[PDB]
Amino acid sequence: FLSLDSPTYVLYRDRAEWADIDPVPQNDGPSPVVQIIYSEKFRDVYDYFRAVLQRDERSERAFKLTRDAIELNAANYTVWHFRRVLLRSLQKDLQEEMNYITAIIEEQPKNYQVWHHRRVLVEWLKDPSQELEFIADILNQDAKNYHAWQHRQWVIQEFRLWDNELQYVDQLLKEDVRNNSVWNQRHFVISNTTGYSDRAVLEREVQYTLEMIKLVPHNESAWNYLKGILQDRGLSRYPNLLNQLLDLQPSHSSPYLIAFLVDIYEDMLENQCDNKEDILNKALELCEILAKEKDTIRKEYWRYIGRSLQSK
Amino acid sequence: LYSLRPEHARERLQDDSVETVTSIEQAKVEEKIQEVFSSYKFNHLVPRLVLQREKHFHYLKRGLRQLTDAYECLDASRPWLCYWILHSLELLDEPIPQIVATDVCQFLELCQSPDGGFGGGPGQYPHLAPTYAAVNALCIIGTEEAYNVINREKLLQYLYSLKQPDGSFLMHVGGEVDVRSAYCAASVASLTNIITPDLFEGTAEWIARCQNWEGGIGGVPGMEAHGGYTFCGLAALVILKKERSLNLKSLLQWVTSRQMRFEGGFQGRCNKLVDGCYSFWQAGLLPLLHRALHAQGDPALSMSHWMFHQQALQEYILMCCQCPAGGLLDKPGKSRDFYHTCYCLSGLSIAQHFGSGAMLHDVVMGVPENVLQPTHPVYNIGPDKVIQATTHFLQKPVPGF
Numbered sequence: 001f002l003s004l005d006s007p008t009y010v011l012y013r014d015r016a017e018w019a020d021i022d023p024v025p026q027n028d029g030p031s032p033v034v035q036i037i038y039s040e041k042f043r044d045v046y047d048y049f050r051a052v053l054q055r056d057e058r059s060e061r062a063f064k065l066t067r068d069a070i071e072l073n074a075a076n077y078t079v080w081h082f083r084r085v086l087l088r089s090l091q092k093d094l095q096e097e098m099n100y101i102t103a104i105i106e107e108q109p110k111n112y113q114v115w116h117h118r119r120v121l122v123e124w125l126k127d128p129s130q131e132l133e134f135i136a137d138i139l140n141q142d143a144k145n146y147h148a149w150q151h152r153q154w155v156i157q158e159f160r161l162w163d164n165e166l167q168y169v170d171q172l173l174k175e176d177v178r179n180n181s182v183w184n185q186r187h188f189v190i191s192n193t194t195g196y197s198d199r200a201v202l203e204r205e206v207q208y209t210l211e212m213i214k215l216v217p218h219n220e221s222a223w224n225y226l227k228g229i230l231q232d233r234g235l236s237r238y239p240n241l242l243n244q245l246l247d248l249q250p251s252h253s254s255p256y257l258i259a260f261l262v263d264i265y266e267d268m269l270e271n272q273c274d275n276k277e278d279i280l281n282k283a284l285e286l287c288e289i290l291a292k293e294k295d296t297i298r299k300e301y302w303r304y305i306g307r308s309l310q311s312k
Numbered sequence: 313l314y315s316l317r318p319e320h321a322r323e324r325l326q327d328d329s330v331e332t333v334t335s336i337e338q339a340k341v342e343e344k345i346q347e348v349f350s351s352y353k354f355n356h357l358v359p360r361l362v363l364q365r366e367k368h369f370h371y372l373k374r375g376l377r378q379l380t381d382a383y384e385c386l387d388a389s390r391p392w393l394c395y396w397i398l399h400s401l402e403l404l405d406e407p408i409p410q411i412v413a414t415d416v417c418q419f420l421e422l423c424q425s426p427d428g429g430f431g432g433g434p435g436q437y438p439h440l441a442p443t444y445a446a447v448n449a450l451c452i453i454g455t456e457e458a459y460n461v462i463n464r465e466k467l468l469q470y471l472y473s474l475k476q477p478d479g480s481f482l483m484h485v486g487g488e489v490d491v492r493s494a495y496c497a498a499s500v501a502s503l504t505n506i507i508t509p510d511l512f513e514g515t516a517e518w519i520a521r522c523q524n525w526e527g528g529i530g531g532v533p534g535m536e537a538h539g540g541y542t543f544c545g546l547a548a549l550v551i552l553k554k555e556r557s558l559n560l561k562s563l564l565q566w567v568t569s570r571q572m573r574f575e576g577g578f579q580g581r582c583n584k585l586v587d588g589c590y591s592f593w594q595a596g597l598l599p600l601l602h603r604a605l606h607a608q609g610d611p612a613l614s615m616s617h618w619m620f621h622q623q624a625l626q627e628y629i630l631m632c633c634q635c636p637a638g639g640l641l642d643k644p645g646k647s648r649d650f651y652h653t654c655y656c657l658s659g660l661s662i663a664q665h666f667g668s669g670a671m672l673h674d675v676v677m678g679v680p681e682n683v684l685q686p687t688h689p690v691y692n693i694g695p696d697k698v699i700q701a702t703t704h705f706l707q708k709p710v711p712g713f
């Protein structure tokens with residue numbers, strides 16, 4: 001009704017329609033701590049919120065007030081709550097509200113209440129029709145907004161909207177193959193639709209992954225993915241693995257190739273294999289290289305793997 | 313210094329020539345960091361890593377009393393500011409005047425809800441975050457008074473009020489759900505000794521479902537592995553004594569991969585940037601993982617170090633996350649705040665102190681005055697405060713009903 005930002009915006013204390021109420025001030029105790037020095041504005045709006053809340057005045061004017069209170073500190077979950085009460089009580093047009101929250105999110109895509117608030121609305125309306133488009137927009141401004149992705153996964157699961165997400169994933173991966181969120185999303189999707197048991201799928205997936213690897217050999221995501229879909233069933237069940245991997249030694253090498261090999265070797269040992277002795281040696285040598293030369297930042301770990309590799 | 317060395321310059325980013333928004337940003341930080349590293353060579357001084365303890369102390373000392381309107385954005389996390397500050401000091405081995413502590417006690421009391429738990433400030437609905445903070449705070453103080461502020465009987469009620477059938481908890485009535493809640497609950501419940509037999513029924517299983525293909529743990533099952541959530545998970549499991557509910561192996565490989573080979577610090581998510589705070593959220597997992605593994609009799613475990621470059625991390629923090637005026641920070645360029653102050657320091661300490669039964673190989677970078685007081689890898693408060701608290705509440709009966 002009156003923008004927090006209008007040059008013509010104003011103190012509630014100062015308002016004609018807000019004179020029947022006495023502004024309840026914050027009570028931080030006689031001897032404050034971590035006490036914030038609020039702007040006359042911030043204090044104004046909240047002193048009044050304290051009151052309306054305290055009275056539990058479920059009025060239109062209160063409603064409009066939480067808006068101001070939220071803009072002042074969108075992280076204030078209490079206000080976010082009372083607002084939801086007003087929404088139900090005053091019986092407010094929710095789609096209208098959807099738009100509101102939509103704009104707020106655009107503004108603080110990293111706030112926790114805003115996203116939850118939206119999920120509540122969607123729930124209330126049982127209408128996911130706008131979600132995937134909205135989210136995409138936000139992920140369009142920050143392809144890695146944890147909340148957005150989280151929100152998206154909820155909409156997809158709850159309303160079973162799996163059909164075009166892989167396509168989406170492929171789109172984003174084309175934009176930044178290093179986007180771990182997408183790789184994850186990719187796993188989320190396939191594992192909830194077809195699963196990785198499907199030979200064809202499995203093969204498709206690795207093939208693809210082996211590509212991205214053999215394309216950006218120092219991109220760790222691809223590696224963790226390939227390892228991810230594989231390692232749940234045993235790398236060692238995968239013969240050519242070692243080989244093709246072995247081929248990339250001079251052509252697409254990184255500590256990742258080595259770590260992976262060390263990983264294969266591990267499984268090839270868990271399952272027992274001829275030449276194991278040698279295998280163990282080859283493995284231990286890699287451990288040292290990674291530890292001593294190739295990836296020393298985690299030398300503690302790499303040597304620990306060398307020691308474990310000793311007992312088991 | 314490990315970082316100032318010439319071969320360390322090979323740990324620089326391999327763009328593969330395929331530049332994406334990610335490469336770009338990473339590369340960006342790397343340069344900003346390089347600069348800080350080469351700070352010494354250009355100026356011709358011997359590098360001397362020092363923790364601006366006094367400057368930090370004056371910063372903290374001040375904030376514990378009042379903050380600028382720049383802090384309005386936190387008006388709902390006051391107990392947190394308490395904790396952060398009250399811990400940093402704690403780590404800095406600084407004093408907590410018997411009067412200031414009281415005020416804190418008194419303030420938190422005002423934050424405490426009649427329904428149990430704590431709110432972000434006086435009159436706010438209870439929330440697990442502030443609750444976790446409040447408690448830790450009170451503990452850090454550790455006095456009959458502080459402890460007596462906590463209404464155990466009500467705490468339980470509250471805790472139960474948020475408990476979900478699938479084992480998770482809400483952060484607050486009508487609130488969201490994610491691992492944070494689990495850790496929050498577990499931490500406060502255990503410390504105060506209010507854990508009933510069914511309180512955390514199935515919680516361990518819920519947390520376990522959060523561990524994904526990355527080996528890491530996410531906010532809720534299905535989500536990307538994340539440092540902040542991973543700590544909550546693990547820590548939570550350690551408290552319930554069920555770490556084994558996870559695949560610790562892959563967990564280990566994930567966290568360890570989170571340390572930046574060139575920067576020395578940690579990243580919250582694969583292919584994300586370094587961030588001081590993760591000095592704790594990520595690095596703290598190792599001490600937790602040590603116990604765990606050692607717990608299932610792991611022989612290959614070190615008796616002197618954590619499974620991460622303690623050196624590098626100390627360097628990063630010391631060289632890159634310290635604010636001249638006082639306070640620590642995300643990374644160079646980023647502003648200072650008590651959150652990062654609280655966690656950079658927490659990370660430092662983690663990096664400076666090792667243990668493993670009776671072993672004690674501390675590693676203090678630069679000026680020995682840089683060493684900090686020790687902190688508990690689960691609660692993130694002085695191990696002595698932890699012990700002190702649990703035992704005090706131990707002599708109280710779990711609120712059975």
Ligand SMILES: Cn1cncc1CN(Cc1cccc(C#N)c1)c1ccc(C#N)c(-c2cccc3ccccc23)c1
Pocket residue numbers: 386389392441540587589642649650651652
């Ligand atoms: C951008 N960035 C890079 N590194 C961190 C950030 C963001 N930032 C710092 C933050 C936010 C608000 C105030 C302070 C302070 N002091 C610090 C964040 C981001 C996410 C979370 C989460 N979850 C938190 C957070 C964690 C634990 C307790 C909290 C209590 C109150 C508020 C936030 C808290 C802080």
Ligand SMILES: CC(C)CCCC(C)CCCC(C)C[C@@H](O)P(=O)(O)O
Pocket residue numbers: 110146441444492495496540541544580581593
């Ligand atoms: C007990 C606790 C409140 C623990 C909180 C631990 C955390 C730092 C959690 C981080 C929350 C999230 C989702 C952060 C992400 O936005 P980002 O990775 O961008 O920092």
Ligand SMILES: [Zn+2]
Pocket residue numbers: 587588589590642652
């Ligand atoms: Zn941070």
